[PDB]
Design goal:
Protein name: Cytochrome c
CATH architecture: Orthogonal Bundle
CATH superfamily: Cytochrome c-like domain
Radius of gyration: 13 Å
Shape: globular
Largest sheet: none
GO molecular function: electron transfer activity; heme binding; metal ion binding
Strand content: under 5%
Keywords: Heme, Iron, Metal-binding
Number of helices: 7
Bound molecules: heme C
Order of helices and strands: HHHHHHH
Length: 115
């Protein structure tokens, strides 16, 4: 259900996640997260947006990737995101990331959920 709607919104459609964390990829994601995402997010505390340490436990990868890559489409069309907007407010969250960058950040998010 929520991953399918996230795929339809796009641009990412599918992310097949291998069982292991790729630590080098995650490390690039850590650096990116601390450049772009900590303007508004923390791992364990609310801030401008929701806490994210366990985002990969409550959401899937297509939703997370398309939040980074198409935040406007997600805000407009995805019911989970639309509800979070009513709670946290409307602001420019688009960091103009590449898919590569977003993928690295996802790997970091997966890693911190195992800490
Ligand atoms: C402040 C300008 C933000 C920046 C920069 C980033 N995010 Fe964000 N995020 C923000 C808000 C206010 C919200 C709630 C929705 C709304 O627009 O009001 C979010 C939400 C998310 C989510 C969804 C969390 C959930 O539990 O489903 C994710 C996965 C997310 N944000 C990720 C994320 C990442 C990885 C960022 C750096 C690339 C990032 N956001 C930037 C506010 C802001």
């Amino acid at each position: 259900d929520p991953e399918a709607l996230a795929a339809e919104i796009g641009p990412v459609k599918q992310v097949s996640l291998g069982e292991q964390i790729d630590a080098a990829l995650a490390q690039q994601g850590e650096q990116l997260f601390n450049t772009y995402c900590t303007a508004c997010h923390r791992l364990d505390e609310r801030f401008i947006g929701p806490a994210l340490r366990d985002v990969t436990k409550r959401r899937g990868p297509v939703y997370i990737m398309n939040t980074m890559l198409n935040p406007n489409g997600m805000i407009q069309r995805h019911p989970v995101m639309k509800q979070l907007v009513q709670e946290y407010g409307t602001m420019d969250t688009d960091e103009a990331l590449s898919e590569e960058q977003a993928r690295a950040i996802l790997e970091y998010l997966r890693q911190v959920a195992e800490n």
